[PDB]
From TrEMBL, chains A, B, C, D, E, F:
It comes from the Viruses. GO terms for biological process: viral translational frameshifting. It comes from Human immunodeficiency virus type 1 (HIV-1). GO terms for molecular function: ATP binding; RNA binding; structural molecule activity; zinc ion binding. This is Gag polyprotein. One of its GO terms (cellular component) is host cell nucleus. The keyword Repeat applies. Transmembrane segments: none annotated.
Length: 218, 218, 218, 218, 218, 218
């Protein structure tokens, strides 16, 4: 990663590596893996990001899908940033291609140069953007449950049902307004009859705290 | 977090991440989780705080309630800080909205800029304030016991009873004067008959050390 | 904690937090917990000290007694340092109250300002003084044994007896001269008959090394 | 490793050493070992690289093959960089031989001098290049499976088959275009009859996400 | 500990504390504990040394003997450094007493001042000297074996016998010349008959490598 | 260890100590222990080296042989560097003796002074040289196998045989040309009949990769 105020390079730490390998080995592609990844790659160069992706053993289907997604994003970047012919001037550096952002056709020195330029070309945050896009696709694809099948059991405490519901919902990754609708309709629509009666008596604009309060002892 | 005297940014450490994930996995929403959180987020940007909140897998009902609370606090902040139209002057930066404090509509650079300004706009401590507010609500809601039901057993050592009583009391989170009353009335009112007689003989203005001393061998 | 020679602030480390939580969970209130605490809070602000105290889950009776002790010390400090009315001058800062030293009515910036002033107002070491006072009271109260009941067994090696004796003695926390008397009288007075005869033959001014040497093979 | 902007030397850390020893002891020569190695040797001198290679106990056949490969690369470097006779001028340093890059005939000071020169002679990245070349040969040789023998089972979920296929493929280390052909032909050619029919119905230019989607419930 | 070239103070680290507590809990008073202690207290102030000594729970007999030894050394220091009456001059600091070196009557600031003075008064290394003296006494006293009782078994490999012999010898802590004599006489004098014959045939001035070589297959 | 470009002293770290103690406790005197030692003592003073050697509990026969070797090297150094009488000039420091390099008759300040002088007297790397010499002698002496007794089993895969062969060879520590001969003759001479026939058919100048390839399926 790159960390008076001058930005300087730093090798990826063994604690970062062990934490990334560990969370991938433990939690596969549960949603919380994506912020953890984002947490462990703060300020990372494309080289660091490729380092974390390549240290993943197994799950090579998902890693291959991630490669496909990264290639699509690189191709779109190339389409929106046509390269200019000519000798790079002294005091300047070439503008990056899609593969330069992905770290496969650029050196570490070129990445450092882009990231510390005035103004900065943040190839690290762009690449991380693409990676997180692909990770979202994988987390969505590998989710075992659908939000339409989360129904509260006849004896299931309301808290556990809400836990399952919002876990699945987080895996869905639909737009914010769509999730507003799902919370607005399915959560009460799929509760068990007693709690469902109580929640109907609560009212349309009910917060989650009020709903969980109403069905506590129930 | 942000840490000559000039304040500088720093990526959240793997030891911080592992400690937060670990304490959430172990202790759920026991009261001591809240200072631990506050301990691990010292000087955190809103990005760091969102990082710790998002790495929590499971307990998605509580995380959703936390989202609701944060939204209420953001709306109140917007109501008390009406935004001003106009171009941001060179040498200044825009004043944050509620969602800018919550880190969802502001960059890391804008957060750093607010936090290191003269005078400082401490969006990190404000956001942490809101988060801790929501965490207090969750700890209160998930507490299994009520302070009115803590009664000393006929053979229960006074120390264990006081432990249960003040644990539950800490979970209650009532105002200071209300807790003064609960200590003033319930603790002796709910002791077992022998210890209760001794404590009555102690006197109204008895400290906890005196009370535990009086019922030691008893 | 606060650490060219200029003193600068630092967030409490996850290794410090985990070590404190761990030693409290393991050893409860054995005497060695108090230096360990003092070890982990070197240069701590009142905020850091409150952080370590608040992360303790359970033992809420002892934590409540600690709160009482801290309140007494704060009240005495207020009685010996009467506050002065008037506007704080530019280039100065208000003198702290008892609750400001305890960190409950002062900001982190005010604590830093007092601790780095010329001359320094060491609110951190004062607060730690009060805390260690209360911890000593708790360690004394929770000790299971009394120094008058430590008697060497008929077959008990002298080393084990001395270990028990000085462990209990350390828990007693009596004044230095009182402990001089206890070592002077009880240790030989409570030895088993054979070792007791040998130690009587040693002489009044016998060191511990000589005494343990004399009853080795015995 | 070597890490204002001035590059400075640093001893290899115990966390790096323990991580390298650990991953070699655990994963032998699975492909992911090579990026991990590259991760733990960022900015390493030839001395650091030899340190990591020499700490490997066992697998001495592979370590010997690695020695052979490094010797070949050193001999080629010597053939392409003929040495020049004459006294090294004040303000200059000798140009390295193959064995100087491999760290066996050069001091740590000479390596530091080459790596921090203007312009730099990056003996560390050259040596790491050779080492990774040999590691690739070993990973290829020790792979238990061939890509032509990966066939989907009659009841095997398509995800598991793709996992095995791309794992083996990663071990193959063939050129990019050859792997394009293998993905293009073998993956569907070796699927089970039902999934194979579906994938044939998908079309020639099918991405992995589409293929795995089509054979999900199947 | 105290660590441009200016010496600066530093709080004792949790890794140091945990390592010291761990080695004391594991190895009691085996000889290797003393260098480990010396290793973990490099550059320590008397406050740090007292911190490590006080964190030891149990073994209070040995800790009490250590207190006695430290008191003797402090009294001797006071006898050889008579204090001078008079006001301490501006730009100077008082000369330390024995108890000031032991850290019980001196502040951390006074210790820092002595240790960083020109010329330095190294109270930390003096105190560590006294402590290591007492630790040597304890290791000597608690050793279970005597060097005169180490005899090679009739079937015991010579290597194991030499291991026991030099372990016990290290616990003896006799002067260098005395240990020269013990190696010179006892080692062969106490070997088993066959090895003893071989070693007699070796010659008087035999090194340990030659002796262990001669009785290898034997 | 000693680490703008100015070299500065540093206390040996608890992670270094724990790693050294751990690897000695685990692997005894396998060859890989020697580079690990060299890894953990990078830039070490003689004090640090003596610290690591002294923390080894047990194996006191080997530690005693190491002492003998270090004494021989010190005596040779004294024979080749005769000391000069006279007062050390202001701005200079005395030239070290053999025992000064071994750290037993020199202070830490004198070692630091030699190591940071212009030009440098590298007592740390000299002492480490002697230590590694003695460690090589011990690893050679304690090796359980001889290279002439490594014979491939009738059903033993060629890879395992080569592993045993080069492990033993590494323990032999013969000169480079001698090991060239051992690889040249014994490896094929001691293979099992079938593999031996294949390797004979390969040719005299066969690399290890070719040999292991030829006897793979065999
Ligand atoms: Cl994995
Ligand atoms: Cl999965
Ligand atoms: Cl890779
Ligand atoms: Cl851009
Ligand atoms: Cl952009
Ligand atoms: Cl579910
Ligand atoms: Cl419920
Ligand atoms: Cl969780
Ligand atoms: Cl819970
Ligand atoms: Cl998230
Ligand atoms: Cl404000
Ligand atoms: Cl505010
Ligand atoms: Cl309870
Ligand atoms: Cl009790
Ligand atoms: Cl606890
Ligand atoms: Cl307790
Ligand atoms: Cl709290
Ligand atoms: Cl004061
Ligand atoms: Cl004061
Ligand atoms: Cl007892
Ligand atoms: Cl005894
Ligand atoms: Cl291994
Ligand atoms: Cl293998
Ligand atoms: Cl080696
Ligand atoms: Cl070059
Ligand atoms: Cl090159
Ligand atoms: Cl397979
Ligand atoms: Cl599937
Ligand atoms: Cl202990
Ligand atoms: Cl013991
Ligand atoms: Cl103490
Ligand atoms: Cl002195
Ligand atoms: Cl002195
Ligand atoms: Cl023995
Ligand atoms: Cl033997
Ligand atoms: Cl050992
Ligand atoms: Cl061994
Ligand atoms: Cl020693
Ligand atoms: Cl020299
Ligand atoms: Cl030399
Ligand atoms: Cl073997
Ligand atoms: Cl094979």
């Amino acid at each position: 990663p790159i960390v008076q105020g001058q930005m300087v390079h730093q090798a990826i730490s063994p604690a970062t590596l062990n934490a990334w390998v560990k969370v991938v080995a433990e939690k596969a592609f549960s949603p919380e893996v994506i912020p953890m990844f984002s947490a462990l790659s703060e300020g990372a160069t494309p080289q660091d990001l490729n380092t974390m992706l390549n240290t993943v053993g197994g799950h090579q289907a998902a890693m291959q899908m991630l490669k496909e997604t990264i290639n699509e994003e690189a191709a779109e970047w190339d389409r929106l940033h046509p390269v200019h012919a000519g000798p790079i001037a002294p005091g300047q550096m070439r503008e990056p291609r899609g593969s330069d952002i992905a770290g496969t056709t650029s050196t570490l020195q070129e990445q450092i140069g882009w990231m510390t330029h005035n103004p900065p070309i943040p190839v690290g945050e762009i690449y991380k953007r693409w990676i997180i896009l692909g990770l979202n696709k994988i987390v969505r694809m590998y989710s075992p449950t659908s939000i339409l099948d989360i129904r509260q059991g006849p004896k299931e405490p309301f808290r556990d049902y809400v836990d399952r519901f919002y876990k699945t919902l987080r895996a869905e990754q639909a737009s914010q307004e769509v999730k507003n609708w799902m919370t607005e309709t399915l959560l009460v629509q799929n509760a068990n009859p007693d709690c469902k009666t109580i929640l109907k008596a609560l009212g349309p604009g009910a917060t989650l705290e009020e709903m969980m309060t109403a069905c506590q002892g129930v």
